[PDB]
Symmetry: D2
Subunit: 418 residues, 4 copies
């Protein structure tokens, strides 16, 4: 009947894996036939997921490094691109705190509904598409690519391999460019004294990463897969079954039956090497920015996998000015980029900008009413010199674009040619 969305043959897929440099050093423990068998007889095309993943991959090789800021609303992402950023970071922490499908405010422990991040990915793409549409009818070519790739937080997948599979598939349907997956069991994090994060076995994370790659393969898009390890601070692990984890197991076992494990950079380096054949980028979660630890981690990983790119979160909570001089702060990301940290981001940038700007405005408004708003309005007028366009609020949300649709539909009215 129809040839629309006809699946590729296993041979074609194998050929891509064998020859496209995108797949150099990418280990897949399942086969091309295994992928085809899961595709049914029609494969939906996921345009934004394909384009974003391809653009992101090229940027990670073409730019000195790719940096991003966590965005929790569509307008936040639009402003990030308008301001010149080339990628968007979709923080799971921010979604938990102010943008998830339960409607509740949550701390970061995989408490929100599992399809929440995919919904925000779709929202951000929709917002970027509107900016793109508006730019086109306005003849605005100041931004080359409105559809900046989105890198989204997949926590640990909300369950087992099938939960990770479904989350990746949903992220892709929504248009994600890349996704990160970590090796802890947040839902078992122990409170207080002698508690802390609980890691899962090294082999279980390889399963997570393998499942994430499989969902992208079945969906037929080259999604960027990022592996995150939480071994830097985690003091517990669910099981001592994996021989690669045994060197760090002390012997003490908790009431819940978990195993105490020695944390630090050593286990991060080891897990990072075990994860490398299964990840396009590796990320060592960290609490305190530390150039030496970063250097130690990257040199140890690259000694084994020289071309392995790394990802890095720049702490949003660290008191930067108190601990570092201005020059160190200014060169921090450039320095990390030289070590191979090609994707860098500040997870909670949106949470801080949103909470701070509203607190400041509201406080001034509670005290001086209109005077406080005028102060913000004047800053917005001043920002126009830098390319800010939201002072023209109707235009910003598409009133001119919808007026054009109305005009297009109205036969007694003509549209202006572009």
């Amino acid at each position: 009947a129809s040839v629309v969305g006809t699946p590729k043959s296993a041979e074609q897929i194998q050929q891509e894996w064998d020859t496209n440099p995108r797949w150099k050093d990418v280990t897949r423990t399942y086969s091309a036939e295994d992928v085809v068998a899961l595709q049914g007889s029609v494969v939906e095309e996921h345009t934004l997921a394909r384009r974003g993943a391809e653009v992101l991959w090229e940027q990670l090789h073409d730019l000195e490094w790719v940096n991003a800021l966590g965005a929790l609303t569509g307008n936040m992402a639009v402003q990030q691109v308008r301001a010149g950023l080339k990628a968007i970071y979709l923080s799971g922490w921010q979604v938990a705190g102010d943008a998830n499908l339960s409607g509740h405010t949550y701390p970061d422990q995989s408490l929100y509904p599992a399809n929440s991040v995919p919904q925000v990915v779709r929202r951000i793409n929709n917002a970027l598409q509107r900016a793109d549409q508006i730019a086109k009818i306005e003849g605005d070519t100041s931004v080359e690519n409105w559809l900046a790739p989105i890198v989204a937080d997949g926590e640990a997948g909300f369950g087992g391999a099938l939960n990770v599979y479904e989350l990746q598939k949903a992220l892709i349907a929504a248009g994600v460019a890349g996704s990160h997956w970590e090796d802890q069991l947040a839902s078992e994090k122990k409170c207080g004294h002698l508690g802390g994060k609980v890691l899962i076995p090294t082999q279980q994370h390889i399963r997570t990463l393998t499942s994430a790659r499989l969902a992208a393969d079945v969906a037929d898009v080259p999604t960027v897969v990022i592996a995150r390890t939480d071994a830097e601070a985690a003091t517990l692990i669910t099981s001592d079954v994996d021989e690669r984890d045994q060197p760090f197991i002390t012997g003490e076992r908790t009431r819940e039956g978990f195993y105490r494990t020695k944390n630090g950079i050593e286990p991060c380096i080891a897990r990072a090497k075990a994860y490398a054949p299964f990840a396009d980028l590796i990320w060592m979660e960290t609490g305190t920015p530390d150039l030496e630890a970063a250097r130690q981690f990257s040199e140890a990983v690259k000694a084994e996998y020289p071309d392995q790119m790394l990802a890095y979160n720049c702490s949003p909570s660290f008191n930067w000015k108190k601990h570092l001089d201005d020059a160190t702060i200014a060169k921090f990301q450039k320095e990390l980029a030289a070590m191979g940290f090609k994707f860098q981001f500040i997870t909670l940038a949106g949470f801080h900008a949103l909470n701070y700007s509203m607190f400041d405005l509201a406080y001034g408004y509670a005290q001086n009413q209109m005077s406080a708003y005028v102060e913000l309005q004047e800053r917005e007028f001043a920002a126009e010199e830098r390319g800010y366009t939201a002072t023209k609020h109707q235009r910003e949300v598409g009133a001119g674009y919808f007026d054009r649709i109305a005009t297009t539909v109205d036969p007694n009215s003509s549209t202006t040619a572009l």
Copy 2:
């Protein structure tokens, strides 16, 4: 069987209508028995909607005036309350541009799914409830009422009287304190030359207000009902059937069948008087903040209804400093309050704070990476002096509250007494 949620009798409802000062000068064209007949045999209690509405009503009489800022996320509302505001305004325009259930960015023309505002009302209540929970376990009594009343945008109800009924019902279920309803048909707004907003007949808006009151009565809560008229700028009206609208009909009818109508403060004053018996507060939509025009509207309506409270939106798009001196800007709301505008707000405060703060941070970040973030962090550290708490990010989203739930559940872990 169970007496949980048993409806009150028509006689009890009538007694409240007859004696509670809340209903002084409130016209209901339907009966107490009509209300009971629509309640089935169980009436769900809507705690937040009841408490919010009672609190708002008292504040409108106890404070010089109640002012608010448009909030589009839960955290935004939390900061508004933390900063000292006593009510939250939930803008439909902001929901259309960055927080509605379609996932798209839209201009203000009743384009988003009709249950969008209710979902944001529920979200803001959840967020305020979390701030309240955290405060209680922290012994923080700095904020006396975290559950600030929410006043939400009902547009024109997304259709007819039954659509307005269902939206008011959904707003109440989500915990709204008050809702506003306007007299235009946004979906038929005409673009360009000789176009403009289209009003509906005065009687149709009374139907809308009557339907919003009926839904509040059936739901057994004293929701504050606000009437907005768009007659200042509207140049069209769907029909000349209502003799109260005839003094403004020009006699011309457009190619789409709408009637040309004389706009300005005159029809606003007439509509306001016709709406007074059906609204707890009245709002004349206006493009230009102008104390004299406000005084003219206020005095004209109060000459007929001396005790009629009014609401006023302080234009977010008007170039304040270009047209008014700092003194006039500084006294603007105070002056309005003296005229009887007891509820005042800035509809797009959130849109501007969110868009501006992210553009500014992202622009600095694109240029100087971490240096830009440090600038925002320093402002946040400085704001702690004014009561800002979001710099303690984990605490802000409830990590301490959930750690307590975790500890409460763990029998081998004791909780510290509050």
Copy 3:
């Protein structure tokens, strides 16, 4: 940069419009350049919407007629295809009563959230895709096309031309094959004596149809557009402004400003002819199935537009056996197909099957417990002979498909070759 999703040029679009027989006799009052101007710089591919629409269009020419049953859940659609049907009808009435995003039960008056039908279209596609996936791994080739095209109810678009545009766009995103649009304002339907449905002007419905076609063109898919007229029973019309509606205007205008208008097959025929250039299929809403009336409508429209295909709803509420003999009932659709009604359906089939089957089972269960369930189970066992598979419940919902994903991910577990 990337060429993924690059829009076609206006010249390419024009060439398709000029040469593809799909567009024979399709009037577009806007231009190819107008379409391109609204597409931004990336056009997402909508695989299911494209494939569905192409398949439906071919079926409408290849089969004697295409018939369908209203489906309100994914499993309902799966059984329709498993049973041999070639298209799925997605009723808005069923969505209002038991499957819309407000969570409430509603009558048919455009009361539910506007994105409700799109969500059910997405759901039905997901369900059919799962049946397809299961079939593929089971080697089941009994059903040739699991992805049967979906024809969905667009009501009157929930507002104006921009609301219709957004609903058509959302239906396409979800994978719809065709959508129907009607010429009434349901939200103003008048109850009781001298009341009834309210039509909108002929030109306003052409605007609706033009807007649905425009959204399909911008989304780059050949969606089947169906026009429905409610003029058989409607007694009112919003305006007498369109001279094509004037022959039916009585001259009386109601207290609400609506115009009394002569109803019946005559205005239906005139509207159908005015709509023909803007619709792939036309449907005259009718309360009484009547082959003669159908013939009269069909012949009157085809006398003007010989190749115009028509759609027909076979009334679910009409007491068939009371008014027609078994022979007439048996030949009804065949007879209609010969008149040119190429798409035929029963709108509320799902509502009736679901409500009846649960009442019957529950009633027996309340009386005789397990005996009642066994009666249904025996019917299911007997239906396996006709191809029914849901008795193997785990398999029916994909347990075998997910076991395969699990096995594919597990390197210590091999999958059996298909």
Copy 4:
């Protein structure tokens, strides 16, 4: 300020626990002060959750037994009540297969978003409320209680204690009467040879049940808590840490690190006794109905806890007629009731009625068109004698109720007194 929703004091709560027979034999390892500390300063009232839980509790003591059928849509539940059932069972399996928030069809492995069952609980209550509203305006007193209690499937809580807490809280907000929680880790279920379900430690399930009780206490409603054990068929357990589980551990450990454990009735009885102080009802999950196993399980539990009520799922997949005579089938539930199984249900009744009725209708329709629908319509007319009302479809979904609202709002129209 307001006293609306003011929390009860710890002393008041303690008093209820000490004196209300509802709490006889209910162990809470946290205190009344612990509950109050988590309530913030306003407790939302959850009317439907309170009424349903109270009604369910009384029915479990007043009736010989309470039985139910799985319902996955609002109309299904309405028909169940109309047909005479006194409770509704909300199956997680059915939600996974045809009614969850991902829009996908899933097998039963906790794959769907965690707030899916709560949404269906709210939908069912909304549908029952509409039936209730319609009955009242129609003067229909044939059904005494339209708001039948809903018992919902909580799987294992989608994570740890905090995930169970949030799910229970969401079920309560939606109006649930009771919820069941099981002791397996579905997301780790192993495939094929030597695989099977994986149990969690006995103490971990006590944590789950303790967390479920805590959420109900904080929400201030007497929710019925049901504990389910999956030890009958589970062959694995995550850890051997709990001494109560050690007697069944063999010693073999799997590649994933799980422990092989001896399954059967013995471990079910042991877990059931450990769960009894934490559950209002206990349920032994089973695959094959077996009166002897049921008798053995109940007598063993009651030997320790004489007043402990039990719950029982009557297998929807067992071939009843093939293995049992008609008399045994007819007395099955009555016999179980005598053993103490006071809540009985068929989990997949809705899935079978929905899939079978649509397959049958569609198959007949594909073959004989209208004749097949007429057959269903005639059965519906015949069912009217038993009280079926859905043949009057407009009435059934509330058209008369909304017409009454329209009339109530219309001052020129009067409503008919009840």
